[PDB]
């Protein structure tokens, strides 16, 4: 194996209002040669958001051939460049804005999605894991543990080996994790390869919009302090963990120092991270680490420094 250092490659999920949308206009897959740059930077694990509505435009029906073939090609490019890919269903536990478990989107439809995903890509060597749902929140919170078991059951029908990244309620917040995660203790995986994946940003409101600077009394351990509730819950309940989303702006050294402190804490506990974000068409996005002319990405140097640290033998923390 598990790389502690990885990146999100975002784009295939953009412009949720345009369904199905057109590739190259509303959403974007990595062009040819994209993964070569990141491979040569020493990054070998990628989290890849996908939009459920584009992969499966009708519930319980087969996957869209056009959208799924773009995923096929992406996985092919990743394989050629020694990139391991975590597929992320980036849908906030909703399908066309309706929560999984309501009458319009029963858990059996979500189970059907995960079956087809695993059936189609269980054989691709570039596929590393399944992040079965990005950030359940709000009215999805109480229904999410039942939906999660259905997603687990869906993958495990066709993929009995690969890890399952299980996110939590309340945008899978690492800071608030123990206040919701106990309902995930009843989740079952016959393969015993479940990893819980929480998210964290270090701006004031923790939204990752970074509308403000670090601030006068900024605490460098803010990142560690916001993941401590998550990591302690992992140790207390003997579970494995993962940080699927974290990013910072490039315009203040205090952000970088806080990121350094977080990566060390995650290293000490063997918790992998997926930086948010890289991607082929982020433009002026403030958290982007994709190369752009005239823009410095000091976050990448920090990622490379910690990628050089001996990858942990399994997901931490150790029991
Ligand atoms: C975790 O929190 C992240 C920070 O809020 C959040 O990032 C948001 O990601 C979406 C896409 O997944 C972005 O929307 C796209 O933004 C570009 C313009 O920057 C636009 O062209 C696209 O059409 C939008 O879809 C959004 O800007 C980010 O804030 C993650 O998604 C969360 O999982």
TrEMBL record:
Highest taxon above the source species: Bacteria
Cystine pairings recorded for this chain: 270-312
**Keyword Hydrolase on this protein?**
yes
The keyword Hydrolase appears for this protein = yes
Key words, A-Z: Glycosidase, Hydrolase
Q: Per the UniProt record, which EC number(s) apply here? A: 3.2.1.4
Give the protein's recorded name: Endoglucanase
> Which species is this UniProt entry from?
uncultured bacterium
């Amino acid at each position: 194996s598990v790389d502690l250092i990885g990146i999100n490659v975002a784009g295939a999920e953009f412009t949720g209002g345009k369904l199905p949308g057109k590739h190259g206009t509303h959403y974007f897959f990595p062009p040819e040669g994209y993964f070569e740059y990141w491979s040569e930077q020493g990054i070998h694990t990628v989290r890849f958001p996908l939009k459920w509505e584009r992969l499966q435009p009708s519930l319980n029906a087969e996957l869209d051939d056009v959208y799924a073939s773009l995923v096929d090609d992406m996985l092919d490019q990743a394989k050629e460049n020694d990139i391991k890919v975590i597929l992320d269903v980036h849908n906030y536990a909703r399908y066309r804005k309706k929560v999984i478990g309501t009458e319009d989107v029963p858990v059996s439809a979500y189970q059907d999605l995960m079956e087809r995903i695993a059936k189609r890509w269980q054989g691709h060597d570039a596929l590393f894991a399944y992040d079965i749902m990005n950030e359940p929140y709000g009215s999805a919170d109480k229904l999410w543990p039942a939906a999660a078991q259905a997603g687990i059951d869906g993958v495990r029908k066709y993929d009995k080996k690969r890890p399952l990244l299980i996110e939590g309620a309340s945008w899978s917040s690492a800071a608030r994790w123990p206040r919701y995660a106990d309902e995930l203790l009843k989740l079952k995986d016959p393969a015993d390869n479940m990893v819980f994946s929480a998210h964290v940003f270090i701006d004031e409101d923790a939204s990752g919009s970074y509308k403000k600077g670090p601030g006068k009394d900024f605490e460098p351990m803010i990142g560690v302090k916001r993941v401590e509730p998550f990591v302690n819950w992992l140790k207390e309940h003997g579970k494995k963990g993962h940080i699927g989303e974290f990013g910072i702006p490039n315009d203040d050294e205090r952000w970088l120092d806080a990121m350094d402190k977080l990566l060390a804490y995650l290293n000490e506990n063997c918790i992998p991270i997926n930086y948010w974000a890289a991607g082929p068409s982020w433009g002026n996005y403030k958290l982007s680490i994709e190369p752009k002319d005239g823009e410095k990405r000091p976050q990448v140097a920090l990622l490379k420094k910690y990628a050089a640290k001996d990858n942990c033998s399994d997901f931490g923390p150790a029991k």
